[PDB]
Amino acid sequence: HHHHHVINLKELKILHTSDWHLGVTSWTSSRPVDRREELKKALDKVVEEAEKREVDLILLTGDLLHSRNNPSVVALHDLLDYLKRMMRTAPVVVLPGNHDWKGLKLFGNFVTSISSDITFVMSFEPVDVEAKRGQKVRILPFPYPDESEALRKNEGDFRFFLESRLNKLYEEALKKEDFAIFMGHFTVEGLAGYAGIEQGREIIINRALIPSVVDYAALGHIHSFREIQKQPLTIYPGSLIRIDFGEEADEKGAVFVELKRGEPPRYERIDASPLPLKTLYYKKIDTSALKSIRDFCRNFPGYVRVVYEEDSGILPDLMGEIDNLVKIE
Amino acid sequence: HHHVINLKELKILHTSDWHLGVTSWTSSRPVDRREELKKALDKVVEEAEKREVDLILLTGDLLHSRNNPSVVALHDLLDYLKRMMRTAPVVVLPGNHDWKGLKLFGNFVTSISSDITFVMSFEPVDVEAKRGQKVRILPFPYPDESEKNEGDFRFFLESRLNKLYEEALKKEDFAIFMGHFTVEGLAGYAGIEQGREIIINRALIPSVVDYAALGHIHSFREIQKQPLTIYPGSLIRIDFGEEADEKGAVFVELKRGEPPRYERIDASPLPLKTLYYKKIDTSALKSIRDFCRNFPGYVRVVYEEDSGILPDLMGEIDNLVKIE
Ligand SMILES: [Mn+2]
Ligand SMILES: [Mn+2]
Ligand SMILES: [Mn+2]
Ligand SMILES: [Mn+2]
Numbered sequence: 001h002h003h004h005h006v007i008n009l010k011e012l013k014i015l016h017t018s019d020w021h022l023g024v025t026s027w028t029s030s031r032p033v034d035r036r037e038e039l040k041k042a043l044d045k046v047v048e049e050a051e052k053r054e055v056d057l058i059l060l061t062g063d064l065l066h067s068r069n070n071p072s073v074v075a076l077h078d079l080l081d082y083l084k085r086m087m088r089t090a091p092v093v094v095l096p097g098n099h100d101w102k103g104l105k106l107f108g109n110f111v112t113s114i115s116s117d118i119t120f121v122m123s124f125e126p127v128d129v130e131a132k133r134g135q136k137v138r139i140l141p142f143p144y145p146d147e148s149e150a151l152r153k154n155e156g157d158f159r160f161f162l163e164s165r166l167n168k169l170y171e172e173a174l175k176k177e178d179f180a181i182f183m184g185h186f187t188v189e190g191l192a193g194y195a196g197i198e199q200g201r202e203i204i205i206n207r208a209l210i211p212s213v214v215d216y217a218a219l220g221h222i223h224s225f226r227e228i229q230k231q232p233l234t235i236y237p238g239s240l241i242r243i244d245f246g247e248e249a250d251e252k253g254a255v256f257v258e259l260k261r262g263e264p265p266r267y268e269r270i271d272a273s274p275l276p277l278k279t280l281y282y283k284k285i286d287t288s289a290l291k292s293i294r295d296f297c298r299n300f301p302g303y304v305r306v307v308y309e310e311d312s313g314i315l316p317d318l319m320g321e322i323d324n325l326v327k328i329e
Numbered sequence: 330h331h332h333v334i335n336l337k338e339l340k341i342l343h344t345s346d347w348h349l350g351v352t353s354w355t356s357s358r359p360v361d362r363r364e365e366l367k368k369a370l371d372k373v374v375e376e377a378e379k380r381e382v383d384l385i386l387l388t389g390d391l392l393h394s395r396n397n398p399s400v401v402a403l404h405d406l407l408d409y410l411k412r413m414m415r416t417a418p419v420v421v422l423p424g425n426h427d428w429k430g431l432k433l434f435g436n437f438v439t440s441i442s443s444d445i446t447f448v449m450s451f452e453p454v455d456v457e458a459k460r461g462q463k464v465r466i467l468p469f470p471y472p473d474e475s476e477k478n479e480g481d482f483r484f485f486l487e488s489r490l491n492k493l494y495e496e497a498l499k500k501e502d503f504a505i506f507m508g509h510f511t512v513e514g515l516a517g518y519a520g521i522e523q524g525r526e527i528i529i530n531r532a533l534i535p536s537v538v539d540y541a542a543l544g545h546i547h548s549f550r551e552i553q554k555q556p557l558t559i560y561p562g563s564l565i566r567i568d569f570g571e572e573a574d575e576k577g578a579v580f581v582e583l584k585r586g587e588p589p590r591y592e593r594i595d596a597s598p599l600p601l602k603t604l605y606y607k608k609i610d611t612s613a614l615k616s617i618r619d620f621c622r623n624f625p626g627y628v629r630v631v632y633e634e635d636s637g638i639l640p641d642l643m644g645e646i647d648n649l650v651k652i653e
Pocket of ligand 1: 019063221222223
């Protein structure tokens, strides 16, 4: 199943998905919920769409695995399974998120060398790939600065380092052939309604420093769908599930992007239809609140957290009674 | 692949037991064996290219660390795999290993490339060689434990081998057994017992295969002729005790209706020597210094009678790696 060769082809169809967090079990400290079933249902939906829409290229922009250090065998198996499924649809380019195990890097470069349908980008060096219908795409990758996960330098020099990398990618973008695509794994500065670091050291990038001459800027790391800017089109697809409370109002899913030479890019969201989350708040846990909790959870198809401040004595066994109540705090 | 189809002939590069990553004599004078090992591997790769082999067989213990291979060792492994894949399709039968990441890696890679196949179960796999020859692989790795009663375990192993024999009978062009174990009753074998060993009678190896590729034993050994069963051996002399064996790979040529033939590809490894002395005296001290001076390999001194504090032999002798 090799690439097609279409002459004078000015179109490129892209599936961009990110932040899978394969392996995640949520609320381990109160009621562990393995998110695998829900997550795979979403991934199957995304794979089916890429097939339906006959995409030319698939972009994976990191945090595909929940465990940055020691992913389980099941999570790794799921990842390789979906990578394989995607490769059968269109060539895949992978920009993994922050990781520590060298196993992914060794694996990545080897697999890239032996197959024309997958490319791992794990440095700042540009890569020229070929899409499903023969389109030439220059990839401009910006991963988490490795080795120096500890900066070993002040904020001024480090910012200048990041800024210098971005200027270099800009210059390399100018030497493109058909299309040029930026792939980044970081936090855009000044994100509207952004919670904060989910237990990690963050790389903060001003959106204006994203090379303006690229056709699409594919970003990952942020769990909410966000259209960052239009020139160049810069998007976080978001995660596929609602990973924790705080993500109740987010849009979750992937994106379909259509590029045409000489024309503005267009996109459509591929919504994951994730299970919903709800936080219930009460001044005090009384019979009025106690019935409010039971009532709500009864017809709610997602997971519920209860927060209350005032002491109410020994609570009744709500969690043993309500299967979708995953936390009381 | 080419599409002759060669049907009648099949040329095989069989190499094994590389032990990438090994540093020897760490508790006396560590010697990183990588330079020597890569020199041998380059020679083996060069030969596969020169001989234009159709199929390359790797039969385990390619990495010295069964649990935690270093990055350099894994990099070297993947480096050589890629080089070999450019020459001919490669079939890999991993040895006794842990981590399991090797297994996830293996099956994925096998799926995405038609130039490499990892066999990590007892299930037969049908592969296609360089010139389109249809090869059936009958793999026999270390079982995943298991290891209850020695009678039922031996019977379990025996049942696997009969199974392989049966599915061998299917075939098409050629059939090739790949095994990682210790043949029973090996002449001059040390150390036995290990005792983390899988012992198999050579007569239990499916007689209807064209070639039986074995790994785990560090010495070249033609085990039997029908079917031709060979341990290629390691590529370097890993420790003292391996002073006398042959190291290298094997080139095997199969022809339908004809008996199989083979030629060794010798690694020309660095030599090893153990020097024995009743006691360390000036006449012994003389022979040690003089021997090591013109010896291109590594030397061990073993002495019986205690001769007090020794002169700095290892400090003045670069290739003396052990005294005991
Ligand atoms: Mn994430
Ligand atoms: Mn991230
Ligand atoms: Mn060995
Ligand atoms: Mn072995």
